[PDB]
Amino acid sequence: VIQVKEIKFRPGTDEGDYQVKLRSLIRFLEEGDKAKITLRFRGREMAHQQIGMEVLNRVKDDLQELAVVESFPTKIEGRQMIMVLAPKKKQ
Amino acid sequence: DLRYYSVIYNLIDEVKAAMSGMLSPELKQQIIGLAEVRDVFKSPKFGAIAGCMVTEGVVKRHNPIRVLRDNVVIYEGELESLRRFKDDVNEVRNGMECGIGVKNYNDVRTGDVIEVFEI
Amino acid sequence: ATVNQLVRKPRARKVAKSNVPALEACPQKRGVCTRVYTTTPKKPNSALRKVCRVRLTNGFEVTSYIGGEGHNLQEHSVILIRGGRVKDLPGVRYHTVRGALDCSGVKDRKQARSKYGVKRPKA
């Protein structure tokens, strides 16, 4: 079956650091796992308007090829926000 | 710039001239072409392609457009892609089948007319 | 060390590098104000210090301090600058001479007036 593995994208994870581990996150998805993005804000229940949805959204948008995301969640639970990412579903 | 003037009258005129030029006012432009769209098509990139028929003038690529329905303007913007068939020509004359699509325009309805105008 | 060595290569004193090259060994220089602004200083200080960028009669363009409380200076102000760094403002190596050319004196000064271009108040 499809497993849950995970990646994180903290703030201060931009292109450099970031898309290196977008490569890591391909890898997760491409094993045939459902790769769960966890944001972990320096922040709160509304940390950001920046932190999350640059990253997350560009992770989707770059990975969009292979993966898509289940939801663009933008409901933070705690000081951290799960964007859930899956294999792109065959219709 | 070094300019010397024998009389004060030739000076008082040109300083004004320098000032008049400084101004940058656009009070309205001249439509380049007016076209009506029919039989919308779907595109992955722009989200929509509205088939068009130019009734007057010539449609151009980078010139701004005014999308209006029933005399009121539903939407405004500048063309990104002007494409007829697979040709993707930058210019379309009047009474020639034409094609159009733009980003950030969600709803294409028949009967409305798009007004393109040069600046 | 060797005498022989010094005889081949004499003692050679280092040439002093200046701290106010824009002055070119002049006591003051004149210049037009290019930008007039404020800037914050270095650890541990904190303020909005008045400085200006000034293009000098000799082409050099430098930043210069505008000391005193209050000044009426703007772009195209023609001022006189003198040597004198501002320590908690790196890059700032000159001072503006209050009360010369377009630069006014400090308003209402009573002590140290001559360092701020202030006439002696009738009294």
Binding site: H48 | - | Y37, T38, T40, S46, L48, E69
Partner: protein, 71 residues
Amino acid sequence: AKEKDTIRTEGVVTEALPNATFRVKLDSGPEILAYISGKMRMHYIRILPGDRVVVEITPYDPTRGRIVYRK
């Protein structure tokens, strides 16, 4: 003496720059470099990247301001 052309306008912490530095966007118009007031730093008072804050602005340089009111 100390002139009085200072102001106390408010704004919101935008960026979390280095060494108690912030992008603080003035509710008024724009944002300024805003540094943390001595007082405030002495009494600690960490300052998250998204707080309503009070700024002291010298007309001399509107581009800059000091954070006075903690939150």
